[PDB]
Enzyme design. Structure first.
Site, short mmCIF file in Angstrom:
data_model
loop_
_atom_site.label_atom_id
_atom_site.label_comp_id
_atom_site.label_asym_id
_atom_site.label_seq_id
_atom_site.Cartn_x
_atom_site.Cartn_y
_atom_site.Cartn_z
N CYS A 100 -5.14 3.30 2.89
CA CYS A 100 -5.41 2.13 3.71
C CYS A 100 -4.11 1.73 4.40
CB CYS A 100 -5.91 0.99 2.81
SG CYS A 100 -6.11 -0.63 3.63
N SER A 143 -2.87 -1.04 4.64
CA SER A 143 -2.12 -1.99 3.81
C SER A 143 -1.16 -1.28 2.86
CB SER A 143 -3.04 -2.89 3.01
OG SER A 143 -3.84 -3.67 3.88
N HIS A 153 1.76 -0.67 4.89
CA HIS A 153 2.50 -1.91 5.10
C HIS A 153 3.50 -2.15 3.98
CE1 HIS A 153 0.23 -2.85 8.57
NE2 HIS A 153 -0.69 -3.64 8.05
N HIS A 210 -4.86 0.91 -3.68
CA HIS A 210 -5.80 -0.12 -4.11
C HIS A 210 -7.25 0.19 -3.72
CE1 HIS A 210 -4.68 -0.83 -0.01
NE2 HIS A 210 -5.82 -1.47 0.11
N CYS A 229 -12.18 -1.13 -0.58
CA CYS A 229 -11.41 -1.91 0.39
C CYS A 229 -11.95 -1.81 1.81
CB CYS A 229 -9.91 -1.61 0.36
SG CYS A 229 -9.04 -2.74 1.48
#
Ligand SMILES: NC(=O)C1=CN([C@@H]2O[C@H](COP(=O)(O)OP(=O)(O)OC[C@H]3O[C@@H](n4cnc5c(N)ncnc54)[C@H](O)[C@@H]3O)[C@@H](O)[C@H]2O)C=CC1
Ligand SMILES: NC(=O)C1=CN([C@@H]2O[C@H](COP(=O)(O)OP(=O)(O)OC[C@H]3O[C@@H](n4cnc5c(N)ncnc54)[C@H](O)[C@@H]3O)[C@@H](O)[C@H]2O)C=CC1
Ligand SMILES: O=CNC1CCCCC1
Ligand SMILES: O=CNC1CCCCC1
Ligand SMILES: [Zn+2]
Ligand SMILES: [Zn+2]
Ligand SMILES: [Zn+2]
Ligand SMILES: [Zn+2]
Lengths: 374, 374
Positions: A46, A48, A51, A67, A174
């Protein structure tokens, strides 16, 4: 065989920002009370997670990220009642404790036990289950799925259908649920409406799926990478626009295209400027704009509140507004009944050992979701 | 007697910013097609009128301000079908054309014929009906009620109950309906909720009335002028706080008082900082904040979009979200049936000739609404 014992396994450790992950051995402690140790089967990449690497999303380092995943329970700690060894499970980056004011609220889903607002990088008890080179390693969002085994608090894991294909349903942990719910639950897109979706990655494509499921008449995809347009149209976009192709700001373009502004807009990138543009492009009196993308840490946007005073609604959400533990098993059941598709999001499959190649694919713009198999 | 003829009458002309209103004779042209000439009976002093004087709100000058009022139709132009001479009427600072996409939308009320987004200070046809000392004078919001007579477009006037007390119901033309609807229609305050209302003037007190009517359990009034607290409690506030009394930012105070954030907050002042504070003090996962106050011209606020990503909803509205021509007569009927009270908002009643004294009372903090009587 492994119950009650430390497990040595491979994980992708991030020792510092802006560096490749290090695939190396870690020690995973056995689960304490109300904790669950999971053998991972598949995990998605993902944005994220990226990030964390880039410093866009700040969480303590060194860390085991990841995650969006699915696996099989290896063992449970004392007092666990909701899963058992052998169950298929999806870890939840947003917990559902079931007891806080948010969990009890009919609309809220950002459970107060989350590790996002004031990141500790720990289990709920403030400690870590991971050691690497003798050093404690932080968790990420209470999940840390870039590891052959992880330990998660019971409030951060959902039991799913025993026949689930884990290499697909990890996306329900997610990206899919976030985008789909942002449209159907947070925005509550209406039949016949016009929607604009900024960002055509895995999450934005899932927003498009939700807008189409809600019966939108027009779904305008917006991305600076025109290579994203074909898949966006396949999943429901009626038209796509690249802001770089226009001499005017895209909010102007979209307002003209929609004869005065769109009904619903979604920012699914993570830039301050596109958050303001997405708000501006919805109709000034009754438009709704939903922020889904993650902004760079601690940065403020600037905007004219007259955009709101005329009547716009601006909101954001984590995980599509879904109460996580309640919703994930139902979403898996819906997937098993063919009520939505996940294959359009999966563009690449790699073994976990090739995690860094998977991140390269994301950063180069070539992938939507790469699924890593353990 | 006056029908079809130019009327010479008294009006309060604002020739330039930051000056007293000039009470002098003007000429009011007869109504053209689809226009209505109204003899004023009462007009309230709204902070938005003061914003024109102060430069907070930019509209072409010189101007006849005033927009919260009630009067009696003196004559109608060709084609008018909704009012007749002798009718009691309330002019509407937000029109309801009934034909634009906003008027046709079930939620929208900011009709595209408004003179707020791109102020022209004219009738719908782009011309003015007012002359003073041989100079053309601008209109304000299509109403211009600081005059013994005004001319308004049919879409900016509502016929009301012939038995209505005009010295009270003029507040339904702006102040009361804006605050009440902001609570009951825009925010949709729920039974048992906790609300915070920033700004305890005429509009903020009307927000409090709406929160109480919606069944809020707690209504926290916030104002830097503690003299406003007594009346706020009379109309429903359970507690009032002055930010100047605290060492900590008031958003932190309100979050602690509400055990983690309020359900609904309202900015009813017109300051960038209080708009962000009001958003921040609502609960991060499910709170709703409504901007009612008017920001200073062309100024942008700065905020962290993580406030929205966690789940907050931020919106604004004009005129409490009410479709103006549909709603004003119904609200008058509701007032006549004792469904709400207007007397708590009226602190001073003065002859129109004392307009400047009425504005001094507002600026000094000494009035809620002054009603000027013609
Ligand atoms: N709210 C939540 O719960 C969640 C939020 N996220 C966030 O959502 C965002 C999207 O995630 P993914 O789809 O995985 O990312 P992604 O990187 O695959 O997709 C982002 C898309 O935005 C496009 N883009 C980038 N800059 C742009 C610009 N200036 N204008 C227009 N388009 C532009 C890219 O070309 C790309 O296709 C990320 O910020 C991520 O952190 C992701 C999951 C859950
Ligand atoms: N959205 C809409 O349709 C409408 C908006 N408005 C706007 O609503 C706002 C309120 O209007 P009124 O009630 O007539 O004004 P008002 O001036 O009577 O009330 C404002 C209140 O704010 C308080 N205040 C000022 N600065 C403050 C601060 N820093 N912190 C806390 N409190 C502070 C004042 O003491 C005062 O009691 C104005 O900006 C007005 O232009 C008014 C009518 C309609
Ligand atoms: O992608 C998963 N979770 C995200 C949710 C939005 C803030 C950053 C973390
Ligand atoms: O007070 C009446 N109307 C207001 C509405 C908000 C913008 C300024 C004018
Ligand atoms: Zn994610
Ligand atoms: Zn909870
Ligand atoms: Zn007003
Ligand atoms: Zn209209």
């Amino acid at each position: 065989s492994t119950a009650g014992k430390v497990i040595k396994c491979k994980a992708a450790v991030l020792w510092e920002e802006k560096k490749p992950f290090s695939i190396e051995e870690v020690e995973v402690a056995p689960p304490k009370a109300h904790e669950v140790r999971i053998k991972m089967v598949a995990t998605g990449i993902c944005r994220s997670d990226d990030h964390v690497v880039s410093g866009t999303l700040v969480t303590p380092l060194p860390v085991i990220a990841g995650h969006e995943a699915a696996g099989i329970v290896e063992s449970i700690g004392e007092g666990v009642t909701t899963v058992r060894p052998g169950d298929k499970v999806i870890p939840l980056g947003t917990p559902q404790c079931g007891k806080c004011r948010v969990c009890k609220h009919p609309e809220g889903n950002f459970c107060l036990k989350n590790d996002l607002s004031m990141p500790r990088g720990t289990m709920q008890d403030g400690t870590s289950r991971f050691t690497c080179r003798g050093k404690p390693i932080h968790h990420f969002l209470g999940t840390s799925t870039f590891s052959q085994y992880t330990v998660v608090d019971e409030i951060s894991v959902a039991k799913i259908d025993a026949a689930s294909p884990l290499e697909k349903v990890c996306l329900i942990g997610c990206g899919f649920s976030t985008g789909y719910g942002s449209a159907v639950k947070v925005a509550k897109v209406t039949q016949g409406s016009t929607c604009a979706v900024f960002g055509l990655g895995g999450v934005g494509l899932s927003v498009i799926m939700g807008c189409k499921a809600a019966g939108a008449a027009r779904i305008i995809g917006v991305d600076i990478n025109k290579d994203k347009f074909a898949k966006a149209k396949e999943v429901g976009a009626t038209e796509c626009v690249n802001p770089q192709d226009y001499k005017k700001p895209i909010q102007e373009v979209l307002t003209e295209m929609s004869n005065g502004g769109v009904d619903f807009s979604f920012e699914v990138i993570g830039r301050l400027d596109t958050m303001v543009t997405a708000l501006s492009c919805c109709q000034e009196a009754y438009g709704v704009s939903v922020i889904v993308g993650v902004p760079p840490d601690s940065q403020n946007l600037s905007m004219n509140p007259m955009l709101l005073l005329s009547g716009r609604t601006w909101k954001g959400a984590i995980f599509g507004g879904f109460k996580s533990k309640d919703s994930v098993p139902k979403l898996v059941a819906d997937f098993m009944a063919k009520k939505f598709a996940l294959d359009p999001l999966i563009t690449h499959v790699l073994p976990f050992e090739k995690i860094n190649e998977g991140f390269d694919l994301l950063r180069s713009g070539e992938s939507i979701r790469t699924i890593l198999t353990f």
